Every structure is written in structure tokens, then in C-alpha cells.
Amino acid sequence: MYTFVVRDENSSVYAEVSRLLLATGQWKRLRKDNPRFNLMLGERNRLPFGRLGHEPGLVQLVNYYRGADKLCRKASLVKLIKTSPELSESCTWFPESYVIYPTDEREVFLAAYNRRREGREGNVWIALISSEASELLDFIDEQGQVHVIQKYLEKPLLLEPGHRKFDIRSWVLVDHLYNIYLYREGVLRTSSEPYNSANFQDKTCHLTNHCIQKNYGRYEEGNEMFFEEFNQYLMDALNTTLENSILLQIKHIIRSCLMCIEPAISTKHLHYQSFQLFGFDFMVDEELKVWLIEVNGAPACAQKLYAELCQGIVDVAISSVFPLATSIFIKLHH
Template identity: 50%
Template sequence: MADLTYLFVQRDLESSVYAAVAKYLQRREDKSWKKVAKDSTRFNLMLGDRNKLPYSKLGQIRGITQVVNYYRGSDIICRKASLVRTLKDYCEKKKLRMFEWMTTSFVIYPPCDEEVKVIGDETLVRRRRSRSDERDQLKKFAEGKPRVTWIAKSSSGAKGDGIRISSDVESLVQMVDSQKKAYVIQQYIDSPLLLSGGRKFDIRCWVLLDATYTIYLYREGVLRTASEEYAPDRLDHLTAHLTNHSLQQELSENFGKYEIGNEMFYDEFDSFLQDNYGVGLDTAILPQIRSIIKSCLGIVQSSLNTTGLDYWSFQLLGFDFMVDSDLKVWLLEVNGAPACAQKLLSGLVQSLVETAIDPVFVPYGRVQHGPNLFDQI
């Protein structure tokens, strides 16, 4: 059997799951994978940052099976504003109510150009938006609801950047108008399920789409926890409201006080649920998570279709969820290039290769290192 080759294009070598995949392929016992130069067009597997992948290299040589680690077009759910628009458009087309696992959400665009008019001695400047948004619908919905709390998130923001929480809709819209990116303004989940110490958390799940668009959920997940007690009356106290690791580590002196690295894993969370609510993770939470994932990815399947292309695709996605005090699961966002908790990385990488790569390029003489932890849903 001829050597299999991979092209590795990566911006951030340290935090990438795909950097770990490349290292894993090189050290496997079957010794079938070899790395090729970045300018090569003769390769079987292309790995790397989704914004840097050279798609022009795919399909140039006939007779070679090629696979890339990204479904082009997946940004329609991997950007916050696009996710909201995609779900709303689907429900409108199907004449359905908005999905109950997504909070009331509106997409707002800042003004992006100016029209200058001179009338007599007066200069008038009118800023225009490049496209229509939902600010009018937001303001109408918020009328008479002064106690509703809202959260504004940049569509392409990361690490908690640009997030603001407020019950004043007008101030949030004005904030968006001072920015350059689209924002999503959503009704804030103000009755979250709280851990010991009254702290918030969200759940990161890893979801794999293989080359046949089969959906797999990784058996392990991580709760990203807050360092401070939840403070509904202090909306500017970010470390009590946002569970992003970078923000918690930078701003809170309590980072790591409750959990190492502010990470709780499924076994401990299951014990928490059993002790406090008499239910298990497998019965109360994961069925909701599976259902949301299947619905979300089913909606966009036709948009990500690879039929007729000269190559195959697969992709690892990070689905982020919140659980409220009624044990109801809410979808927060979908990440198109998720990092992985270090504790889970080796198992995730091995399972990804065995689920998404090995079925296309059947290995020989390989010794399995451990169980495959991806389950089809």
C-alpha cells in the first residue's frame, strides 16, 4: 500500500486539535502517513485553520482521494448572527415557531457609511446601515418589558470580547452602532442552573461530521465554570456572568479555586445532578443536547452538501449549551474550530481519526490505543 500524505496548514500550532491530529498520524504504529510540503498538490488529507485552507489545491490531480477538515459553508451556523438568521429563516420558510432551545434573538448591524448633505450653512451627516437589521423588532418586543435582561454579543467575537449585559435595550443598540461588526442581542437566561458556590457554567460538547455527513457526539464534555457567585443585580460583574476561560483567568482572583482550570467534567456533573436533583446527566441533559444538535445540523445539511465535488469533507464542531434552573438546555453558539480541554485531547484526537479519517483511508497494521469515544446520534 502506498504512503498516505497530508498537507498541514495551521495558524496556531499550540491550541489546535488538528495540530494534535497531525502529530498522532505521524507517530501511529502503521507508519502510513507522511507530511508533504505546503506547496504540494499531491496529498490525501488537508488539515488546518478553516480560514487559511488553500481549497485551490484540492481536486487538481485525478485518481487521488482527498479529504479536508472543514465543510465549506459551515459559517452559516458558526457565526452568531448567521446562526440566528439561519434558524429564523428556516422557521419562517416552514411556518414554524422559533425553536424553544434558542432564546429570543435579534441581529443588529452598525451603520457603515455616511451621506453628507450641505443645506445652506448647515452640514447634515446621515449614517446608513449596509443592510436591514432587526432593531425595530427588538425595540417593539422590549416595550413594556423593563425587567427583561439582554446580552449583546459580537457575531465574530471570541474570548468574551465585546459582550455587554443590560436591561436597557436602547443603550445596547447605541453600543452596537459604535462598532464595526454585526451583533446578536438575545434575551439573557437569568435563571441559570448554579453549581456549588452559586456559580454559573456552560457546557462544551464536541460534535463530528464525517465525510458522509453522519453526526457523532463525543462521549465526554466539559463544563466551563465561573469563578464568582452569580450576581443578577450586578450585570457589569463579568466574571459572575461569563464563563469564558480567558476572561475568568484574566479578571478573577478566584480562577481555579473551585475546579482546576475552571473545568468540571461529566462524571462530577452527573454526581452533582444526582445529589441535588435526583436525575442523571444521561437522562436529564444529554437527550436534550442530542436533539438540539441533530435539529441544527439537519437544517443546514443541504447548504453544506459536498455532492459533485472532487474531495470529501469532515469537521469537528464545538456546541456550547447552558442549563437553566428547570434543567432545560439552551443552545448558546456553535464553534467551527473548537479547542479541547487538555485532559480530553488525546482521546478526542484518536477517536476523530478512527471515525472520520480511517473509514476513507483504511489503515493497515494499526494497533488501537483505546476506545472510540464518538457515538453516532
């Protein structure tokens, strides 16, 4: 009889995980502040990693990797990529980005902003989306917090019929042995409104968030295109496949990012153990080249896939540690 606690109620994902665990009749849920747990579905902020693995006669596990936030914060991700020799300055799959502090690499950003203007090529960026450096810096200093200025992808791949923009979400699970598991089912969070190249003011076709979009539900149910359809579209429209044209790059980026920070967050020889579900967001251009936008440490799944994914998390990340009395994942070997 294993025991666990829940310290994040807003977790749509692990609300399903806990539900599944209780339904096995071998997992019991304790109170929030009961330290005698085997598993900890912890909070997002101020997670007490320091109090883990100190309970005698209790193998402890947590659904978060301490230090993974360096990958899941935009300001940190840019720094991580620019400073890590494994990824380096000339990282091919990460858009040109700079960290800007409200009144730092501001002077470095302007140096590149000039080559774009003194080259008569695409000089559009994103924090809002603008082509002028002045309108951007004034916006950052008016908000308050730190922002990152990133090169905007002016030539994205556009779905048809619709001339629609989109972004790819991949759910990745890293177990206690640091095995990198990619969920076979992803999702294209699409824009229902056609992409407008000239007017950047209309952020309803540049930004493909599920909330902003909610033309909702015109082409596919809920502005969400799964892989079997997007793969079929590529075959019919571009004579290629999702596996070859896009997914190899995705699996490369995922494998690269997690290999980089492995020696920092790995709980291999620690007194407590860690796993974590990640949410990688990508952006494909017209020449079928995958770009990494960012990484979510606390991702929400899609309605159709909650039943399958949450079960998978229990199977490989939890039950692997705490056993009970074909696979949906793709293991990115390293």
C-alpha cells in the first residue's frame, strides 16, 4: 500500500493521475502536510525539495525536477542556450533572442537590429509583435517585469484551406532514470483566422493560444489538429510525412535540451527521486524547419489525450518505482 499527497489542486493533469491511483486500490491519498508519503504531487512555486528523502523507511518520489525551471523560463532558457557549449551561440533550432531588463544585452540587440535594417531583410520581432525597436523597448519598460525580445518568424508554414498559422505541442516525460519519453500523440494548436503578413496589430492570427482563439471550431473541433490529420495533410499537400519532415527535428531538440541540463537536475544518486512532465512548443516554417519557442514545466494536456497520457505517467514514472501486485511513448535514446 503506497501513499501520496496532492499540493497542487489546479493541476488538471495530476488530478487525473491521483484519480487513477486511488482507483487501483493500492494507492492511498494522505493530507497535504503528512510527511509520510511515497509520492508527492507538489506545488508549482516554493516546492520544498529540501525536506524530501529524509523519512526513514520511505522511498520518496516527486513529480518535479529541481532546477528544471532554468529550461522552463524564457529568460533562463535563452541564457541556458547562449552559455551552454552543447547548444552554443550558433544554435540552429532556437530563434535569435535577447534578454532585456526594464530601466542586460540591450546594446547587443540593437547591433543585430541594424544588420536587419542595413540588409533590407525581415526585421520583425516579438516580446507584442512589432518591427520597430523603439515601440518594443517602451512596452517592456511600461509593463514592469523582465521580458525577452525574440526574432519573429515572418515566413511560417500555413495550413490549407485557410492560410492558417499554428504551433506544435509535444508532451515529454522524464522518469527517475532520466529516460526521455516522448508522447506519440501531439497537437497542432491552430489559428482559425487567416495569417495576415502586413498587419501585426491583429494578434488573433499571429498568436495561436487555445484561450485567445476562444472562427473557433470551423476547420477542426476546438482549433486542435491531431497528428493523424496533419500527417495526412503533409502527404497530400507536400508529399512528405510528419515523422521525416518535422518529428526528427523535434526529437533532436527535446533530446538536446534535456541532455544539457542532465548533470544539474539528475536525481540518480540522490536520497530522493524525481520525474517530470514537460511541454515543448515548436514552430514550423515554410521550408519545413522546426523552431523551439519554449518549454513548459507545468503543462496542460488535451481533452482527448488526458485518459491515455495520465495513464502513461502512472505506468512508467510512478509504478516503475512503486510496483503493483504497445507503449504510448517514444524513448529518445542517449
